[PDB]
Symmetry: D2
Subunit: 311 residues, 4 copies
C-alpha cells in the first residue's frame, strides 16, 4: 500500500500533468499519483485569485488524498507557500516544488525535484509542519523559505532559521519544525472570500520618490508594505506619506529590502507614535501576504502587530 | 605617517575633530583631519549629497593621501557605488559605518574606523575603486551590499567576494574589481547640479501598476524594476514599462533576489521592448548606474553597453 | 525578583570572575550573578577531565541556581557544548559564551556576548532546548553549532539546521528547537566516571599515510573517527587499517572533513560489511564526543549506529 | 571551433571517447578529444597521478587549445591546487566532476561537462590559473573547496569568491587570483618521480600526540596541523611538532576551521618555534604547497615566504 498523492499544477511541466508518472516513472515506487491542472500561468503573474483557488481546493479535497504536491514557478513560490501556510486547514503534507532549469535542458532539475517533493508529501513525518517547499534535496518551511539567487538550482534557502530536513536516498531526517503558528492554528479562513484586501509594496533607496506610496494611497489601498533600508527605515518623503496614510486608515507595515534579519520594533522608528507595524523576519512580499490576511480580521495596528508576532 | 581625511556625513561612529580622541590608536597609523560634510541619517541620503561628496573628493585629492567617509549603513552600498563611478582621485577612498551605536556595549564603530584608516593608508589600496571596510574586510563598492538588518557582519560582496581581509593592521589583497571604475569611467559630475530622475518599482504577486504609472506620469527619465526571479515582471507592471520605453523612458530590469545576475537572453526579449538587463546590480545599485548613464545617453543599446562595462 | 545565574569560568576573562558584574555592570539589570572559576585554560587544551568536571558541577548545582553561563575559549567551544548537551541532566538553561577579540582590544565582543548569554540563561523560554551557545546576538544549539571562520566575530553558526533564535534589545524570538535527543532524554550518565573511552581522529586527503590510524590502533584506542573526504570516504591505506581495526574491537565512525552536510549510511561505503558507523551531520570532533559516550554504553556497531541516529 | 582535450581520471560523469555522444551539444562548441589518464576514485588520489597529470598537460600544451580534466569531487580541490602550481601551460585547464551519478535522475555531470568545455574554450579563461567549473560557476584552484557532502552546489571559493558565472554558454569574468600560479611559480615537477612526504594531523580536545609522533618517527619531511581556531594546537601535539621542527621537520599550522586565514602574529610565535602559518590554505591545500616548497627548501623562513606568495 502506497500513499495517494495529488499533484496540483499551476503552470508548465517541470519534468518531461497526467503524464508525469511517465516522465518520472519512479514515482510509481513511492506513491499513487493523480494530477490536476488548476491553472496554467507563469509565476511572475501569480495573483490573489490563484491563491484563493489553491487554498479552497486543498481544504475541500483534504479527505480525498494523503498529501499534496503543487508544481509552481520559482519566481513567486515563496509567496504562494506562505499564503497557503496561513490558510490551508488540511494538516496532511502540502509540498510545493519547481525547477530552475527548463525540463528540456541539460541536467534539468525538475525530475528529481518532483520525485523528492512526492517523497516528502508521502512521509508521515511531514505532517503538521505547515506548508513546505522542497528544492535541491531540502525540505523548507513556507514562512522562511526565499529565493536567494536568480539562476542557481540551490537558490531556495530558509535564510533566517534554516531548513527542516534533508532528503537522501528517499528518506528525510527532520530535525526542525516551525514554531510560528500555521495552517489549522491560524484564524485566517478564506473559504468564502472571492477577493483579498489590497496591499502594495514600495521600495526605499536614496532620493526615493513618494509617488509610488501616494499612488497606492490615492487608490484606497487597504495596506502598504515598505521595503525599508536597513532595519526597516524609510526615506523622508516616503515616511511622510506613510505617516499620513496610517492616520487615515491605511495599515502600514515596515519590512526591509535587506535579505536576512528582522525588522524589529524597538529601533529607529517609533511605531506606536506613527501607528506602524514591524514585520520581523518577513521580507516585503511575505509581509504583504500576512498583512492581506490580517486585514480580513482587523484594521487596528496593535492587533496587526500581534498577528505579526504570532504567525 | 600618511595624511588621511575623514569626511563625515552623519553622527559619530566611535565632533568629527574628536575621533583621534575616541580612537587614540589612529595617531599611530595616520595624521587624521576631519571635516563634517553633511549630518543626516543615511536613510535620507540623496543626489545632492552624492554630488557634494564626489566634487569634494575630486577637488581635495591633491591635498591628502587618502579619504575615509563615515556614513550610515542603510544606504552605504549606494553611495559607495556612486562614488566608485564618479571619483577620479585614484588615492584610496574608503567608506565605513557601524551597526551598533557608539554608546552601546561592544560598539563596532571604533575598530571599524581604525581598519578603514588602515585601508586608506595602505598604498596597495589604490587603484581598486571606492571601497567599503566593515568587519575586518575590504569590499569593493560595486558588489558590496547590506545582507542583514542587525548583524555587525552584514556587509558582504555577495557575488564575487571581498578584495582582502585585515589582520593586525595589515591587508592581504587577493582580488580587485574588473569592472571599470573611477578614472576609467566617462561619468563626470563636476559641473552637474542635479541627476536624472530614476525610480524603483517592486514586483510581487498581484502587483499594482500604479507605482510605475506614477513615475511615468511624473516624466521620470528612468525606472528600475525590482523583478522576480531573473528580472521578470508582473504583467501589469510589464505592460506599463513597455509602453513607457516606447516613449523614451529608460527601463532597467533588476531583481529583488539578493544574489545573482539579471541576465540577457532569459525570459524577457530586452531588445524587442527596449529594456536593459542589470546583471549583478541590485535595484538600488542599478539606479545609480542608470542615473549616470542618462547623463550621457538615452539610447537603450548604449545603456546596455554601459551596464556591461561598469 | 531577578533570576539567579551562575557563571562558570574555564579560562581568562572575556570582559574587562567575581569582577564581571563590575566589568559588565548592566548584568545587574537582568540577573543576580555569581561567578566560580572552575578551571583556567586555553580551550585549545580542553580535555576529558574538564568536561567531566563541568557536567558533574552543573548536575550537582542545578537546584541551587536558575541557569548557567559557561565562559570558554572559542577554539573548542563546539565540542564542550555538545558534550554537555549529552550529559547535563539539568533542564534549566545552560549557555556557553566566548569572545573572538581580546577584552582589551578595540570593539571587544566579550562584554555584549556575556550580557546576551545572561539574557539567554535568564529567559524561561530557553529551558528544555539543550545546551546552548550564544554568540553574535544569536542562540545556537550545542549539536549543530560550529566555528566557521578563524577570526570573525560572527564565526559561530549552526551550519546545517540554523539558529534557534535571535536576540534584540534583550529579548529572544525563538522559532526553533533541536529535535535530536539531549540532556535528560539521553542515557549518558557521567556522574561516577573519572575517565572517558579513548577516541582519536584521523584526517583523509590525497596520498594519506596510514600511520596515524595505525598509531591509535597500536595504542588500543576504543574508537577512531575518520575525517573522510566527501561523503565520508577514506583513502585506500586508511580504509585498510580501519577495516582491520573494526573487526578487532575498535569502533570506527566515518565523518567528513567537509564542513556541512551529513556523512550518510547508503553511499559508497558498505558500513554493514565493514562494521563502520556513519556520523550524519556530526563533524569529526562532534562525532568523537558522541562516540566516546556511546562507548560508555556499548561496543556493538549496530547499537552505536542507532545512537548516532538518535542523539 | 577550438580543440579541447578531455583528460579523464575516473568513471564517466555523463568510454571517455563517448562523451560527445553523451553530451552531443559539445560538438557545437568544441572539437573534443578524450584520453583516459587513470581510472580511480578520487578518494584514492595520490602523488603519482598528480605528477602524471602535470607532465601530460605540460607536454601536450602545444597540441591543443585547452584542457578539461574529469575528476572525482572528493579531492578535486587538492588536485586543482597542485596543477595550479605546477602546470606551465597558460592555455585554460579546467577541472570538473559531478555530485550525482551519471545514471541518476537529474544528473549534474552533463551540464557540468558542457560548462567546463565552454570555460576551456573561452579565450578569457587563459592566464587565470587552473580552474574548477561546477554549478555554473568558474572557481580558482587555490580557494575552491568542497563545502557540503552531497549538494550539487558544494564547490565554493569560500574566502575570496568565484571568478565568473556562466549563463547561456557565456562567462562574465569579474575577478582573477592575485596569488602567483602556473608559469609564475618556480615549482617544476617535470623530472620528479616522487614528492616530499607531508602528512596531516587533526586537533581537537584531548588530542593524542601519537599521530604526529608516528609521522615524525617515519621521517616525514613536513607535517600540516589542522589546528583549532586560528591554527592553535593541543598541547601534546604542539610539543611533538616543536621538537620535530628543531630537528628539521617542516611544520605548517593550518586550521580545521573551514574559512579564514591561519595568521602570523596571533597566539603562536611561529618564528620562535620554526613553524609556518598557512594563511587561507586549508590543511589539504597547505599540504600541496608544503610538498612543493620542500622540493626547493627546508628553511622555515623561506617556506613562510612561499606561503605568502603562492
Amino acid at each position: 500500500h502506497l500513499p495517494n498523492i495529488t499533484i496540483l499544477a499551476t503552470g508548465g511541466t517541470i519534468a518531461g500533468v497526467e503524464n508525469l508518472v511517465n516522465a518520472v516513472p519512479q514515482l510509481k515506487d513511492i506513491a499513487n499519483v493523480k494530477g490536476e491542472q488548476v491553472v496554467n500561468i507563469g509565476s511572475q503573474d501569480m495573483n490573489d485569485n490563484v491563491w484563493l483557488t489553491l487554498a479552497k481546493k486543498i481544504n475541500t479535497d483534504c479527505d480525498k488524498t494523503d498529501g499534496f504536491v503543487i508544481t509552481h514557478g520559482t519566481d513567486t513560490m515563496e509567496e504562494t507557500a506562505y499564503f497557503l501556510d496561513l490558510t490551508v486547514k488540511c494538516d496532511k503534507p502540502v509540498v510545493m516544488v519547481g525547477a530552475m532549469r527548463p525540463s528540456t535542458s541539460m541536467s534539468a532539475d525538475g525530475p528529481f525535484n518532483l520525485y523528492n517533493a512526492v517523497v516528502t508529501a508521502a512521509d508521515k513525518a511531514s505532517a503538521n509542519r505547515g506548508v513546505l517547499v522542497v528544492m535541491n534535496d531540502t525540505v523548507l518551511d513556507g514562512r522562511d523559505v526565499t529565493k536567494t539567487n536568480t539562476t542557481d538550482v540551490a537558490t531556495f534557502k530558509s535564510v533566517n532559521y534554516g531548513p527542516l530536513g534533508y532528503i537522501h536516498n528517499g528518506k528525510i531526517d527532520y530535525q526542525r519544525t516551525p514554531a510560528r503558528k500555521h495552517t489549522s492554528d491560524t484564524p485566517f479562513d478564506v473559504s468564502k472570500l472571492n477577493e483579498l484586501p489590497k496591499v502594495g509594496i514600495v521600495y526605499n533607496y536614496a532620493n526615493a520618490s513618494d509617488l509610488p506610496a501616494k499612488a497606492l494611497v490615492d487608490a484606497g489601498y487597504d495596506g502598504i508594505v515598505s521595503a525599508g533600508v536597513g532595519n526597516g527605515n524609510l526615506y523622508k518623503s516616503v515616511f511622510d506619506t506613510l505617516a499620513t496614510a496610517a492616520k487615515t486608515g491605511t495599515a502600514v507595515v515596515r519590512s526591509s529590502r535587506v535579505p536576512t534579519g528582522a525588522t524589529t520594533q524597538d529601533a529607529e522608528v517609533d511605531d506606536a507614535k506613527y501607528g506602524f507595524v514591524a514585520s520581523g523576519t518577513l521580507n516585503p512580499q511575505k509581509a504583504r501576504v500576512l498583512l492581506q490576511l490580517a486585514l480580513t480580521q482587523t484594521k487596528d495596528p496593535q492587533q496587526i502587530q500581534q498577528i505579526f508576532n504570532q504567525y
